[PDB]
Amino acid sequence: TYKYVNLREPSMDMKSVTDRAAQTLLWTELIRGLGMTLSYLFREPATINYPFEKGPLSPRFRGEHALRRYPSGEERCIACKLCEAVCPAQAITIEAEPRADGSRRTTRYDIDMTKCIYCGFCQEACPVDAIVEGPNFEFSTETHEELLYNKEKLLNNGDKWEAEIAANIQADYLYR
């Protein structure tokens, strides 16, 4: 089915013709448009009072990255490199070796946050919930070098944000 957006014939009875003459001379349809903007003047504005108020977000929000731990404090990451393999941007760089206790752990874990596209594939790929995108989006920096995260930065992010990250994962892990 289709419809015509603009295929109508104006009527030619004297009343309709005068109605259009009054429209042309008295600007009635322009006055009508002024009414709409006037109504908006007296509507409450939609503006929120940032930074004292914040736009709403959901548990799935993809923000700044963080490396997580088990409740014992051991790192979850076991250097499988799945996140590195899937990263569409090649933003992840990893090196690994047996730890002094034999554990399979990384010695390098970098995320170039200026390469990253904040797609969340890395956290989908991680089999142990080690790498996540946290809820923080307020981490703009004054220098480029400050956005080249190494393992120490990412672990500090996890320790900094774990309280929120764990609750966000609790809310959404049953959709995953």
Partner: protein, 318 residues
């Protein structure tokens, strides 16, 4: 004591202009479902001060290809002439009482156009030139109709003196016997002030910034102050012409309050109109005035010559 009176005219003009910029941004904002400046000072009251200081400590640029003297002259003319427009205004007493105040205002409005033409030409850049030549077309569009609209109204006042319009409208606003002319006058002032939907010589979405695209910092501010001063002055002129305030010689401040309220609301209407409509095409502006207003203005001019004579109500010469 006259020098003091001059300063008590132009210092307030510039302060009113600065806070008209804040008012416009708030009025547009709320009409756009937002707030507008409300952080710099309470309710944004210091925002005009911040912008003014910002611009005058910004680096001013003289373009490599520009004609230096004319580049500097044009903004000086713009603001100088804008302030000159205010001296014959009766609020209720003019600073300068002129026999032909209306004719003086017409002449000074024509001279102010050259601050657009010369700034655009002196910039020696294509967008600036295009903006200036749009000002030529705009002036050609409205100037003839604007003068004849005034003439038809003055056939009821009887003189070219601005203060006589107060006497003329002591019983009734001239908006009643001449609302068709008020309609056409009001539109002509939007074109005269380069205001939306006739903001063509700047035409941001088309010409980036048009005639003033090469201007920065203080020289640019002069053009902004000029335009906003003319917007207020032309609505005071509209209030005097068509919404005459009664004048009590012993309480002249009652006139000033009533007249100031009327002029403010007319200025708010300019912002309201900017919020509501799309922009004209500058050839469509020329056809609006010449093919619609001018035939009607000529007819109404004939009518307002005959009407006083046929009703035996010709006004006094004095």
């Amino acid at each position: 004591m006259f020098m003091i009176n001059i300063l008590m005219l132009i210092i307030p003009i510039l302060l009113a202009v600065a806070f008209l910029t804040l008012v416009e941004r708030k009025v547009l904002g709320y009409m756009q479902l937002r707030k507008g400046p409300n952080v710099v000072g309470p309710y944004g009251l210091l925002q005009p001060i911040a912008d003014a200081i910002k611009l005058f400590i910004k680096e001013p640029l003289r373009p490599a290809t520009s004609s230096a003297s004319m580049f500097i002259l044009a903004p000086i003319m713009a603001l100088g002439l804008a302030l000159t427009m205010w001296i014959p205004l009766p609020m209720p007493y003019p600073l300068i009482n002129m026999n032909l105040g209306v004719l003086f205002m017409l002449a000074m409005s024509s001279l102010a156009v050259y601050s657009i033409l010369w700034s655009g030409w002196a910039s020696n850049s294509k967008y600036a030139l295009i903006g200036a030549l749009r000002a030529v077309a705009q002036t050609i569009s409205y100037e003839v109709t604007l003068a004849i609209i005034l003439l038809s109204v003055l056939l009821m006042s009887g003189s070219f003196t601005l203060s006589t319009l107060i006497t003329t409208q002591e019983q009734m606003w001239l908006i009643l016997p001449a609302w068709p002319l008020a309609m056409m006058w009001f539109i002509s002032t939007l074109a005269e002030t380069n205001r939306a939907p006739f903001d063509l010589t700047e035409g941001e979405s088309e010409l980036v910034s048009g005639f003033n695209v090469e201007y920065a910092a203080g020289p640019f501010a002069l053009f902004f102050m000029a335009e906003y001063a003319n917007i207020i002055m032309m609505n005071i002129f509209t209030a005097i012409l068509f919404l005459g305030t009664s004048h009590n010689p012993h309480m002249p401040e009652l006139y000033t309050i009533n007249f100031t309220i009327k002029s403010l609301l007319l200025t708010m209407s300019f912002l309201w109109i900017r919020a509501s409509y799309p922009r004209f095409r500058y050839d469509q502006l020329m056809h609006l005035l010449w093919k619609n207003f001018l035939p009607l203005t000529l007819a109404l001019c004939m009518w307002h010559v005959s009407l006083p004579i046929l009703t035996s109500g010709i006004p006094p010469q004095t």
